[PDB]
């Protein structure tokens, strides 16, 4: 599991469950190609998006569908989604955790990268 | 100006100066059209991006070039840039401040919407 | 004023108004002595807490009464308050801005120190 | 394990290892009584601070020794420590994760509370 996504809810103090996550990889023609997608679990985590074989060097975009999450809770939030864009595996394979802590008008996002 | 961008540096405890900022508006064909751009001032602020006349309801993207900022400081960053995507809605008079607090492997972003 | 406090609300996307703020300075006996206090304005800012003469090097604590703020909004909070503890150091001319971005179960706090 | 502390480093994109953490509980005389302490592991986590029996209702303070952490990395940080003050177990036993994401001039802290 070289790529994991974790989402937390700062209003409730809980994992953000059933959040849609779409991952894209930048192609040679400079366009965003769909790479993987899924929904966060009861722990606010999304595992099994990819494999070490498939997750080659490149520029990746993780789109976290925060608006649909807040709308289902009765909040009209500010952002359409939280977008995380980064170069992966350029010095060899790494394990990446992309995390976001969500509020209606804000989000904090960070990465934990391990060898 | 109805749209202001503010960028802060959490490593130095200072405004993030000379940061490139690009604003886009989503077109009918679903593509991102360049809308406005600039560089943050000595106060980490970017004023005068648009006018009330030009800034109509729509979906906007604010791209903050964080990678170039960290590279100029000799600090290895994670993100290619920080992206803020939101709908501008005419619910009475409004001013939008899009802010970001930057760290090499994280950023927090928020919006202050006032009348 | 060499010390300003700014508080923002991440649920509403607005300044956090009428928030009580208490500043303390650590005394020789290791206890926290009241130093200054006030309430944030309509811009979420608290100015005029001290003067350059009074604000000597020392360890200071800024306590932001977040619980009372959330309770007045009918939102169940986690923290009793947000506490910022720091040393003020005379390394040339300095102005300190202590800022906090509040959510019910989280807060981000940062400092902008300028000349 | 009803109380766990997790600390992350936003400069390195890694767990914050060997961070000292002190927990206090407010006593009847309004003073902070030492309750538990420890150091974060290689995963940036501190488990086994207390037991369900010992962790009774009360006001608790978790002091995360961020200054010593940054000083050991060659950074002179802004804060003396990150302080998290909260009421625990007032509606019955809960499991609490207190987390902090650290930068030299900023920190974000949140709680994940589960039943």
Residue numbers in the entry:
A (entry chain B), B (entry chain A), C (entry chain A), D (entry chain B): 10 to 124
Extract from the study:
In its native tetrameric conformation, TTR transports retinol-binding protein and thyroxine (T4) in the blood and cerebrospinal fluid. Amyloid aggregation of TTR occurs by dissociation of tetrameric TTR into monomers; these partially unfold into amyloidogenic intermediates and self-associate into soluble oligomers and amyloid aggregates. Here we identify two segments of TTR that drive protein aggregation by self-association and formation of steric zipper spines of amyloid fibrils.
Therefore, we decided to disrupt the capacity for a steric zipper by strand H by substituting residues Thr119 and Val121 with the bulky residues tyrosine and tryptophan. The size of these side chains is expected to prevent formation of tightly packed steric zippers formed from amino acids with short side chains such as Thr119 and Val121. Aggregation assays of TTR variants showed that the mutants T119W, T119Y, V121W, and V121Y did not produce aggregates after 4 days of incubation. The side chain organization in this peptide also explains why the residue replacements T119W, T119Y, V121W, and V121Y impede TTR aggregation. Because residues Thr119 and Val121 are pointing to the hydrophobic T4-binding site, we cannot dismiss the possibility that the tryptophan or tyrosine could strengthen the hydrophobic contacts to increase the stability of the protein and delay aggregation. However, the involvement of these segments in the formation of TTR fibrils was supported by two pieces of evidence. For additional evidence, we synthesized and analyzed 6-residue peptides containing the same substitutions, and they did not form aggregates or fibrils in isolation.
